[PDB]
Design an enzyme around this catalytic site. Structure first.
Site, PDB file in Angstrom:
ATOM      1  N   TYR A 134      -4.207  14.295  -3.174  1.00 31.97           N
ATOM      2  CA  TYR A 134      -4.659  13.573  -1.976  1.00 31.97           C
ATOM      3  C   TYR A 134      -5.809  14.237  -1.233  1.00 31.97           C
ATOM      4  CZ  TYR A 134      -3.797   9.938   1.597  1.00 31.97           C
ATOM      5  OH  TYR A 134      -3.899   8.846   2.445  1.00 31.97           O
TER       6      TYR A 134
ATOM      7  N   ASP B  22     -10.306  13.814   7.258  1.00 32.63           N
ATOM      8  CA  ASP B  22      -9.546  12.833   6.489  1.00 32.63           C
ATOM      9  C   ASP B  22      -9.354  13.269   5.033  1.00 32.63           C
ATOM     10  OD1 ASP B  22      -8.264  10.331   5.914  1.00 32.63           O
ATOM     11  OD2 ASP B  22     -10.195   9.481   5.309  1.00 32.63           O
TER      12      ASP B  22
ATOM     13  N   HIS C   9       1.729   4.162  -3.121  1.00 40.46           N
ATOM     14  CA  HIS C   9       1.577   5.618  -3.101  1.00 40.46           C
ATOM     15  C   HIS C   9       2.689   6.275  -3.925  1.00 40.46           C
ATOM     16  CE1 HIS C   9      -1.896   6.409  -0.692  1.00 40.46           C
ATOM     17  NE2 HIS C   9      -1.432   5.805   0.388  1.00 40.46           N
TER      18      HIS C   9
ATOM     19  N   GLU D 150      -6.129   6.389  -2.605  1.00 41.98           N
ATOM     20  CA  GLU D 150      -6.223   5.391  -1.541  1.00 41.98           C
ATOM     21  C   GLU D 150      -6.628   4.004  -2.047  1.00 41.98           C
ATOM     22  OE1 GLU D 150      -5.609   4.770   1.696  1.00 41.98           O
ATOM     23  OE2 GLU D 150      -4.214   6.396   1.289  1.00 41.98           O
TER      24      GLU D 150
ATOM     25  N   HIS E 293      -9.768   7.908   3.003  1.00 43.36           N
ATOM     26  CA  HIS E 293      -9.718   6.531   3.500  1.00 43.36           C
ATOM     27  C   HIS E 293     -11.106   5.963   3.719  1.00 43.36           C
ATOM     28  CE1 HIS E 293      -5.699   8.038   4.833  1.00 43.36           C
ATOM     29  NE2 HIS E 293      -5.326   6.830   4.445  1.00 43.36           N
TER      30      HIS E 293
ATOM     31  N   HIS F 261       0.853  -1.192   0.000  1.00 38.93           N
ATOM     32  CA  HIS F 261       0.000   0.000   0.000  1.00 38.93           C
ATOM     33  C   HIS F 261       0.893   1.248   0.000  1.00 38.93           C
ATOM     34  CE1 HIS F 261      -3.673   2.362   1.439  1.00 38.93           C
ATOM     35  NE2 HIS F 261      -2.677   3.185   1.724  1.00 38.93           N
ATOM     36  N   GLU F 262       1.891   1.270   0.878  1.00 48.36           N
ATOM     37  CA  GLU F 262       2.763   2.439   0.964  1.00 48.36           C
ATOM     38  C   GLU F 262       3.613   2.623  -0.295  1.00 48.36           C
ATOM     39  OE1 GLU F 262       1.770   4.229   3.231  1.00 48.36           O
ATOM     40  OE2 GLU F 262       0.883   2.739   4.565  1.00 48.36           O
TER      41      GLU F 262
HETATM   42  C1  LIG Z   1      -5.055   5.322   7.738  1.00 49.58           C
HETATM   43  N1  LIG Z   1      -3.819   4.846   7.119  1.00 49.58           N
HETATM   44  C2  LIG Z   1      -3.780   4.016   6.076  1.00 49.58           C
HETATM   45  O1  LIG Z   1      -4.790   3.581   5.534  1.00 49.58           O
HETATM   46  C3  LIG Z   1      -2.427   3.596   5.565  1.00 49.58           C
HETATM   47  C4  LIG Z   1      -1.887   2.505   6.489  1.00 49.58           C
HETATM   48  C5  LIG Z   1      -2.749   1.237   6.464  1.00 49.58           C
HETATM   49  C6  LIG Z   1      -2.637   0.482   5.142  1.00 49.58           C
HETATM   50  C7  LIG Z   1      -2.381   0.317   7.625  1.00 49.58           C
HETATM   51  N2  LIG Z   1      -1.454   4.685   5.636  1.00 49.58           N
HETATM   52  P1  LIG Z   1      -1.427   5.918   4.499  1.00 49.58           P
HETATM   53  O2  LIG Z   1      -0.192   5.850   3.645  1.00 49.58           O
HETATM   54  O3  LIG Z   1      -2.719   5.822   3.697  1.00 49.58           O
HETATM   55  C8  LIG Z   1      -1.352   7.391   5.525  1.00 49.58           C
HETATM   56  N3  LIG Z   1      -0.968   8.534   4.718  1.00 49.58           N
HETATM   57  C9  LIG Z   1      -1.350   9.781   4.959  1.00 49.58           C
HETATM   58  O4  LIG Z   1      -2.074  10.046   5.894  1.00 49.58           O
HETATM   59  O5  LIG Z   1      -0.925  10.868   4.100  1.00 49.58           O
HETATM   60  C10 LIG Z   1      -0.560  12.121   4.685  1.00 49.58           C
HETATM   61  C11 LIG Z   1       0.746  12.592   4.090  1.00 49.58           C
HETATM   62  C12 LIG Z   1       1.945  12.273   4.728  1.00 49.58           C
HETATM   63  C13 LIG Z   1       3.154  12.700   4.193  1.00 49.58           C
HETATM   64  C14 LIG Z   1       3.167  13.453   3.025  1.00 49.58           C
HETATM   65  C15 LIG Z   1       1.972  13.775   2.389  1.00 49.58           C
HETATM   66  C16 LIG Z   1       0.758  13.347   2.923  1.00 49.58           C
HETATM   67 ZN   LIG Z   2      -2.730   5.223   1.862  1.00 45.48          ZN
END
Ligand SMILES: CNC(=O)[C@H](CC(C)C)NP(=O)(O)CNC(=O)OCc1ccccc1
Ligand SMILES: [Zn+2]
Ligand SMILES: [Ca+2]
Ligand SMILES: [Ca+2]
Ligand SMILES: [Ca+2]
Ligand SMILES: [Ca+2]
Length: 316
Positions: free
Chosen positions: A157, A226, A146, A166, A231, A142-143
């Site tokens: 986003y 969010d 991105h 997502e 999400h 998943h990561e």
């Molecule tokens: C609620 N979290 C999730 O769904 C997954 C982790 C999941 C697969 C365990 N993590 P994610 O990569 O979607 C969290 N990312 C996020 O919140 O983005 C904010 C961001 C962080 C850094 C730079 C730009 C934007």
């Molecule tokens: Zn994500």
């Protein structure tokens, strides 16, 4: 670092033994030279400065509890690299073998993981909501996905483009989980979520509503939390993807499943050839229909199924 490629051994977050590609130069580093321009795993040491220090180990054995999240971040990055290369002919996240960097032990009690624009970052969890998040292959993929999205479609986003962003990460996270073929499912994060509760997960693609996420466009969230529900509204697209692959009848609309490999081909083509930073759900439908048309033909079952699936989730 400059050194000679070696093979270490250790245990991951769930207690499973695996071999990992390392590099020897005085110490054994978590640096895998066998894939592109390398996979590098770092120790953030419970702090928030990134990337931290390239993971160094005296003996090339990684069986300490503290080692486990690093073992899994490093190994599952390798699996995800292999998936994109072998299945989609894509070399790393940028398509040009960019070095893949991950940091583990980020912060304290940190119940999340993310791509920060340049690298993957994994919390250890607080032991209640999550255990160390790199223990989930779907989470790692998943990561890294991105990063793939950011280098290709560039989906902004927030709001609908962010929900697509997502869903793309959940879709390929799941396809990588199936690729590795260890307890695969259409749930997200089940391996590291709530160690005290069996059978749950952070999200479900097969039935997003089990966690209150929408499975129809009529139920889309339009508030500001969010990033406009990225999400949350991902459930609508995750459901469509699940239906395309596995089939089903959803709010009375029947979808003929075409399988995971074709789902992956269709969505990879959409992501890399048709989606743009501002694509909305209706535009994703068009992109997926066009992608299926390119790959299988306008009169194909594949095209018909993509249409059925988006009809079923209320996206025209
Ligand atoms: C609620 N979290 C999730 O769904 C997954 C982790 C999941 C697969 C365990 N993590 P994610 O990569 O979607 C969290 N990312 C996020 O919140 O983005 C904010 C961001 C962080 C850094 C730079 C730009 C934007
Ligand atoms: Zn994500
Ligand atoms: Ca050691
Ligand atoms: Ca699983
Ligand atoms: Ca899963
Ligand atoms: Ca659980």
């Amino acid at each position: 670092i400059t050194g000679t490629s070696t093979v270490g051994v250790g245990r991951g977050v769930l207690g499973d033994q695996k071999n990992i590609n390392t590099t020897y130069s005085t110490y054994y580093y978590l640096q895998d030279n066998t894939r592109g321009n390398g996979i590098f795993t770092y120790d953030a040491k419970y702090r928030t400065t990134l990337p931290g220090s390239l993971w160094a180990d005296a003996d090339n054995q990684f069986f300490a509890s503290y080692d486990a999240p690093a073992v899994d971040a490093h190994y599952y990055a390798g699996v995800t690299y292999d998936y994109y290369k072998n299945v989609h002919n894509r070399l790393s996240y940028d398509g040009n073998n960019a070095a893949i960097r991950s940091s583990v032990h980020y912060s304290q009690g940190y119940n999340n993981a993310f791509w920060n624009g340049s690298q993957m970052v994994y919390g250890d969890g607080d032991g209640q909501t999550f255990i160390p998040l790199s223990g989930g292959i779907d989470v790692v993929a998943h990561e890294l996905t991105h990063a793939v999205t950011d280098y290709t479609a560039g989906l902004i986003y927030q709001n609908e483009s962010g929900a697509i962003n997502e869903a793309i990460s959940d879709i390929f996270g799941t396809l990588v989980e199936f690729y590795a073929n260890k307890n695969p499912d259409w749930e997200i994060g089940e391996d590291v979520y709530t160690p005290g509760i069996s059978g749950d997960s952070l999200r479900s693609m097969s039935d997003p509503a089990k966690y209150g996420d929408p499975d129809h466009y009529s139920k889309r969230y339009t508030g500001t939390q969010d990033n406009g529900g990225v999400h949350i509204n991902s459930g609508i697209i995750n459901k469509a993807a699940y239906l395309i692959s596995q089939g089903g009848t959803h709010y009375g609309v029947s979808v003929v499943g075409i399988g995971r490999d074709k789902l992956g081909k269709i969505f990879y083509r959409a992501l890399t050839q048709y989606l743009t930073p501002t694509s909305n759900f209706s535009q994703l439908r068009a992109a997926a229909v066009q992608s299926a048309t390119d790959l299988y033909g306008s009169t194909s079952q594949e095209v018909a199924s993509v249409k059925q699936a988006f009809d079923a989730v209320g996206v025209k």
